[PDB]
Amino acid sequence: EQRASPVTFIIATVVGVLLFLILVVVVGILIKRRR
């Protein structure tokens, strides 16, 4: 629990930031710019 809870939060943060830069920033904001 003491090391496993902050390591699980770092694993969830890196997959959430990777899904935001691909799905929201590239196929969303940058596809609205490239029209």
Curated annotation (Swiss-Prot):
Instruction: Report the superkingdom from the record.
Output: Eukaryota
- Changes after translation: Autophosphorylated. Autophosphorylation occurs in trans, i.e. one subunit of the dimeric receptor phosphorylates tyrosine residues on the other subunit. Ligand-binding increases phosphorylation on tyrosine residues. Dephosphorylated by PTPN12.
Its subcellular locations are: Cell membrane; Cell projection, Ruffle membrane; Early endosome; Cytoplasm, Perinuclear region
Segments spanning the bilayer are 9-31
Family note: Belongs to the protein kinase superfamily. Tyr protein kinase family. EGF receptor subfamily.
As for what it does, the entry says:
Protein tyrosine kinase that is part of several cell surface receptor complexes, but that apparently needs a coreceptor for ligand binding. Essential component of a neuregulin-receptor complex, although neuregulins do not interact with it alone. GP30 is a potential ligand for this receptor. Regulates outgrowth and stabilization of peripheral microtubules (MTs). Upon ERBB2 activation, the MEMO1-RHOA-DIAPH1 signaling pathway elicits the phosphorylation and thus the inhibition of GSK3B at cell membrane. In the nucleus is involved in transcriptional regulation. Associates with the 5'-TCAAATTC-3' sequence in the PTGS2/COX-2 promoter and activates its transcription. Implicated in transcriptional activation of CDKN1A; the function involves STAT3 and SRC. Involved in the transcription of rRNA genes by RNA Pol I and enhances protein synthesis and cell growth.
Q: Subunit details for this protein? A: Homodimer. Heterodimer with EGFR, ERBB3 and ERBB4. Part of a complex with EGFR and either PIK3C2A or PIK3C2B. Interacts with PRKCABP and PLXNB1. Interacts with MUC1. Interacts with HSP90AA1 and HSP90AB1; the interaction suppresses ERBB2 kinase activity.
* Protein name (database record): Receptor tyrosine-protein kinase erbB-2
**Entire protein: which part is shown?**
647 to 681 of 1257
